[PDB]
Amino acid sequence: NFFPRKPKWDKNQITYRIIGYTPDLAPETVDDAFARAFQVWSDVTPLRFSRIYDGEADIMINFGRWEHGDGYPFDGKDGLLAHAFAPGTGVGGDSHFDDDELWTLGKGVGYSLFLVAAHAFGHAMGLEHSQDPGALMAPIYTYTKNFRLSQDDIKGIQELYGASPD
């Protein structure tokens, strides 16, 4: 359920910056997908995720293929879809998406940028894999048309950061 030594953010505002995009979707639809992915965690905690348009954000977001700047290379089609670093300084929290995947918001012909980002941002906030088959933090991708964060996910994220104020 957590990384070794339970790293977490020691603040409630987490900045993020989208360094670059995929050509597979419109940029405003990518922005919206990342926003919605953060909101699944915002909604049940006091966390807020603020977009910045320059400088060093807590979560630097980018797309790449194979070796893309951190010595944990992507792998072409399928397998590694995205990866995130546990909370911390430098690369901590950074979330990368493999552009050898076809990015979509639906089923079958690619991977949901929304669902993959929500899972990866769970890692960026300090959650490890769940063994609860219904949890977003369960390790195996699926497309869900009616996505609902599980009580397992809510329990983990609240254990680190507490519950929503409202």
Binding site: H83, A86, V91, P139
Partner: peptide, 7 residues
Amino acid sequence: XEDALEX
């Protein structure tokens, strides 16, 4: 696979 990294 290794989608959750430490550092």
